[PDB]
From a paper:
In the mitochondria of eukaryotes, adenosine triphosphate (ATP) is produced by the ATP synthase, a ∼600 kDa membrane protein complex composed of a soluble catalytic F1 region and a membrane-inserted FO region. In the mammalian enzyme, the subunit composition is α3β3γδε for the F1 region with subunits a, e, f, g, A6L, DAPIT, a 6.8 kDa proteolipid, two membrane-inserted α-helices of subunit b, and the c8-ring forming the FO region. In addition to the rotor, the F1 and FO regions are linked by a peripheral stalk composed of subunits OSCP, d, F6, and the hydrophilic portion of subunit b. The proton motive force, established by the electron transport chain during cellular respiration, drives protons across the FO region through the interface between the a subunit and the c8-ring, inducing rotation of the rotor.
3D classification of the images resulted in seven distinct maps of the enzyme, each showing the complex in a different conformation. Initial 3D classification produced three classes, each of which appear to show a ∼120° rotation of the central rotor within the F1 region of the complex (blue arrows), similar to what was seen previously with the S. cerevisiae V-ATPase. Further classification of these three rotational states was able to separate state 1 into two sub-states, subsequently referred to as states 1a and 1b. The state 1a to 1b transition reveals a bending of the peripheral stalk towards the top of the F1 region near the OSCP and F6 subunits. While MDFF with maps in this resolution range cannot be used to determine the locations or conformations of amino acid side chains, loops, or random-coil segments of models, it can show the positioning of α-helices in the structures. Figures 3A and B compare the fitting for state 1a and state 1b, illustrating the accuracy with which α-helical segments could be resolved in the maps of different sub-states. Fitting of all available atomic models into the density map is shown for state 1a (A) and state 1b (B). The largest change between the sub-states of each state can be approximated by rotations of the α3β3 hexamer relative to the rest of the complex by angles ranging from 10 to 16°. All of the sub-state to sub-state transitions include a slight rotation of the c8-ring against the a subunit. The different sub-states do not appear to have a specific sequence or represent specific intermediates in the catalytic rotation sequence. Instead, the differences in conformation between sub-states when taken together illustrate the flexibility of the enzyme, a property that has been linked to its rapid rate of enzymatic activity.
Author numbering:
A (entry chain W): 10 to 226
B (entry chain G): 111 to 219
C (entry chain T): 1 to 58
D (entry chain I): 1 to 47
E (entry chain K), G (entry chain J), H (entry chain Q), I (entry chain P), J (entry chain L), K (entry chain O), ...: 2 to 73
F (entry chain H): 15 to 145
The structure:
């Protein structure tokens, strides 16, 4: 009970502080504190907005909340362990519905039978051939929404292996270090090559897909 | 002598003006030289026309005029693009090259 | 900067408390974190110029 | 433009260094003629 | 045999993820050599980069569905 | 089957001549343009002009530079800057110039100068090519 | 044996979807290079890209048919 | 031994279609990028893409006949 | 074992036609992009595409000889 | 069978790393032939190469976790 | 066991000719588009094609040397 | 069983090193055509080619470690 | 089991030479489509072709040393 119950509020709370702080910054104070923290949403409104609009002002800020949430949630699975093999997997499955619901909000809710009428009328799906539209509805929604859960789970898998293989290498060669240090030095560097790259690209995927919907809607 | 009548009605709307056109007769090089200078002067990209006396016969020329093509913004886009299978660089570096060619020609004309 | 450093420290402790947490898992991650710091402090200074000056100007 | 807009040079300049180099080269009788035919003989004189 | 072949059959469908991972290397490659030609980087080309990486990862998510079905 | 207009300021070498090919040291890469060729302008390297005239000829030239202008239709306009028959180009000079060049390069500080020098080198070299 | 080799054969046929996955990337990649050369994006070239994704998924549906026949 | 090995024989023979699907993506891509350079589309070149998508599927019908031989 | 390993072994040798299948699409693909650059179609270029489909189906004929050696 | 075919099932799941390895060669090759056109080294072409080698080894981490599931 | 695993193991080494056959379509295809830009047909280009296919089918003759060493 | 299928598990893990070998050619071959456009040899392209050789042979190292895992 | 699995364990490691087989065709093929752009054939390009063919037969020097370890 406690362990799972403690986890979800914590993921919420880390996202909450930045989201409270920026509204506050609009006249006081600032001292050291407010200006330092203000930089967080300044990086969000700097980096992500280079792609947005695109789909227009209306839908922009709604999506940016989730894009930040996904990246921040993975960062709160980076440093904690044990965490990846169980707690992060339960969080990937707890984030699964939001990712499936993200297409529903505008696509399937207004048109279940042909959500591609909002997403992409002419493109990947052939408008001349209604058969291919329904076939490629899986490749453009049903399946990509399952892939978005596997997308965070691929980071979970590569991050987990670093640590399991670590664990097993120092357990196999408990020399202090010694030969295991050579392998373990590589396994360290893999955290940047794996997580820090793949975590960024993960919320890029959510960005692009949720643009392609609302831009043609 | 261009600017000797249109010297007399403009002067610093010219950038430079050239003699030795007469008093010994022009060369291509020269055309390239001017071709070069035309560019750096950002009047380039405000388009021009190139007006010269196009010879017809000893007695006559018809002052001819063309519009500038040394702009890579002609080398840009347009239907111009659709006549291409090559990028607006080596095109643009023809806008260059041709400026000399024509300029020479016209100059001579 | 100090608050963030405190926040990270707390999270690392919560991790270590978590039931399974072996030396090897931890050593990889802590080194993985450590590498970032030295770059990060130089980055935090370099970052600094833009936004608060850009705010002040605008 | 490897340097014909990327280290200056125009097609004009580039080329002109070429011709110039050709003039630099070539045999001399021809090089006399250089300064004649297509040898720059602009006199940059505003008027 | 009845329990053995499911394990040997899950790995064999995981070899069908070698076609999706190189088909993403060709689509993103020809977009990296399709942006050097310039200039419509945003829209047109890189907007069809996710539209070309959707039909090419569609063969992987169907193959990793046949690999998971022999595991569960 | 190309009307080859091969000209330089100084010369028209071929003028809409029924050349079968011109093998082109267009800045591009080796390309042997026959006949009509797409509206494209490709600018010419210093190289040789080899004028595969539709008849076995290849007329020789070294070309300084210039542009090929490939006009959709049957016509090619090689507007070669100094494209000279190798005859009148000077081997002795090519090397000598190249050494000299190598001397210059060093002082061809600034890429625009270098550009010219490397060009010169390239030139002299290119003279060394065929000469 | 008979209820065993059907699972170690239906999995090997999913390795035939490696050509359907890497064929979708190559047919779309050269379509992303062909539309980078301009200009007939709306029909002619990207219309033929649909006639290239079909003649490449046909060697992926015929391979997925043989895998489904050895599983059900 | 007799009933089993014929199921693990038409499964590895379906891994020969991994060329007929990717090679069709190679030919139809080269016709997608080839028609970009223009202009022989409704003749000459797209009439050579049908002669290419057949020779590629020619090792996709020869391989498919072996998987249909081991089964029935 | 004697009739088993020759029935599953003749299936693994049919994965050698995946090379000739995609290898035929490339040699007929570069001939589609080559004749796009024009114009020596008959003779020279399209006469070399036969010399490129023969050296590619030679490994196919070498692979189809192996699968027929364990089948007969 | 149980403590056997999972050791030969992790071998077949490691064949999926032939697409994450040959997809990186296709990606980090077109960003070398595209930078040869120049001059978008930083911020544009190599920045998209980080997002090109992110969806290339993503099919490989999904293939390295499939073999890790058939071992631990 | 000593003769059975020699018939199904000589079939897995026949999949090593998939590289010599797809590689031959790349060594001749990149020679078709090579002579398309022309003009050095005899010598230089086609001479380099012979020294390339010899280094492409060498991984086919050595792979058929490990195939025939398992059956003869 | 324990000693048997560990030998046939390392062999299929060595087939995952077929992506690095063809990845090595498609990454050091695009740089063999990059310097053909010239002149960034020992500057930008040949420097990134080593950063392209490392990203592809690592997917060969992460596959040879699975082959060494099922051997010691 | 011990001697039986050493025969179908060096045969699956012999199909790793398909990456070096087509990788040598992709490397030497790019050099044939590079010297066609001309003219740095002697050194620079063909000298770099000996650096790319060695880095592609390097995976061939690690895959043929694997199958030769399960032999004697």
């Amino acid at each position: 009970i406690t362990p799972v119950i403690l986890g979800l509020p914590l993921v919420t709370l880390i996202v909450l502080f930045p989201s409270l702080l920026f509204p506050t910054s609009n006249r006081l104070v600032s001292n050291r504190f407010v200006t330092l923290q203000q930089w967080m949403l300044q990086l969000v409104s700097k980096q992500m907005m280079s792609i947005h609009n695109s789909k227009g002002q209306t839908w922009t800020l709604m999506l940016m909340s989730l894009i930040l949430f996904i990246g921040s949630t993975n960062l709160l699975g980076l440093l904690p362990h044990s965490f990846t093999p169980t707690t992060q997997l339960s969080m990937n499955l707890g984030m699964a519905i939001p990712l499936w619901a993200g297409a529903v909000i505008t696509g399937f809710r207004n048109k279940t039978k042909a959500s591609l009428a909002h997403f992409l009328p002419q493109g990947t799906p052939t408008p001349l051939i209604p058969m291919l539209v329904i076939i490629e509805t899986i490749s453009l929604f049903i399946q990509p929404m399952a892939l978005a859960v596997r997308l965070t789970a691929n980071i979970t898998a590569g991050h987990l292996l670093i640590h399991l293989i670590g664990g097993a290498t120092l357990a196999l060669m408990s020399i202090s270090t010694t030969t295991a240090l050579i392998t373990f030095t590589i396994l360290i560097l893999l955290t940047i090559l794996e997580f820090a790259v793949a975590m960024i690209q993960a919320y890029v995927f959510t960005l692009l897909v949720s643009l392609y919907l609302h831009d043609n809607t | 002598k261009i600017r000797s009548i249109l010297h007399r009605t403009h002067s610093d709307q010219f950038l430079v003006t050239f003699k030795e056109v007469g008093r010994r007769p022009p060369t291509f090089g020269d055309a390239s030289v001017i071709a070069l200078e035309l560019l750096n002067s950002g009047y380039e990209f405000d388009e021009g026309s190139i007006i010269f006396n196009r010879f017809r016969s000893v007695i006559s020329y018809k002052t001819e005029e063309k519009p500038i093509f040394s702009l890579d913004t002609i080398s840009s886009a347009e239907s111009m693009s659709i006549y291409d299978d090559i990028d607006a660089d080596v095109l643009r570096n023809y806008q260059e090259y041709s400026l000399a060619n024509i300029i020479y020609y016209s100059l001579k004309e | 900067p100090y608050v963030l450093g405190t926040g990270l420290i707390l999270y690392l402790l919560s991790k270590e408390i978590y039931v399974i947490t072996p030396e090897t898992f931890s050593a990889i991650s802590t080194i993985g974190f450590l590498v970032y710091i030295v770059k990060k402090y130089g980055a935090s200074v370099g970052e600094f110029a833009d936004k608060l000056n850009e705010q002040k100007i605008a | 433009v490897a340097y014909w807009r990327q280290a200056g040079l125009s097609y004009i300049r580039y080329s002109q260094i070429c011709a110039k180099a050709v003039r630099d080269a070539l045999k001399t009788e021809f090089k006399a003629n250089a300064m004649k035919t297509s040898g720059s003989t602009i006199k940059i004189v505003k008027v | 045999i009845d329990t053995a072949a499911k394990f040997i059959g899950a790995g064999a469908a995981t070899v069908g993820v070698a076609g999706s991972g190189a088909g993403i290397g060709t689509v993103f490659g020809s977009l990296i050599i399709g942006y050097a030609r310039n200039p419509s980087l945003k829209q047109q080309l890189f907007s069809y980069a996710i539209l070309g990486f959707a039909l090419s990862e569609a063969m992987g998510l169907f193959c990793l569905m046949v690999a998971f079905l022999i595991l569960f | 089957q190309m009307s080859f207009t091969f000209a330089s300021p100084t010369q028209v070498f071929f003028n809409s001549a029924n050349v079968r090919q011109v093998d082109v040291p267009t800045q591009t890469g080796a390309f042997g343009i026959l006949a009509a060729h797409v509206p494209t302008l490709q600018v010419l390297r210093p190289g040789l002009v080899v004028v595969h005239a539709e008849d076995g000829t290849t007329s020789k030239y070294f070309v300084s530079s210039g542009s090929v202008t490939v006009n959709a239709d049957s016509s090619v306009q090689l507007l070669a800057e100094e494209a000279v028959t190798l005859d009148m180009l000077d081997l002795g000079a090519a090397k000598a110039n190249l050494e000299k060049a190598q001397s210059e390069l060093l002082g061809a500080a600034d890429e625009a100068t270098r550009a010219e020098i490397q060009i010169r080198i390239e030139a002299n070299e290119a003279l060394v090519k065929a000469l």
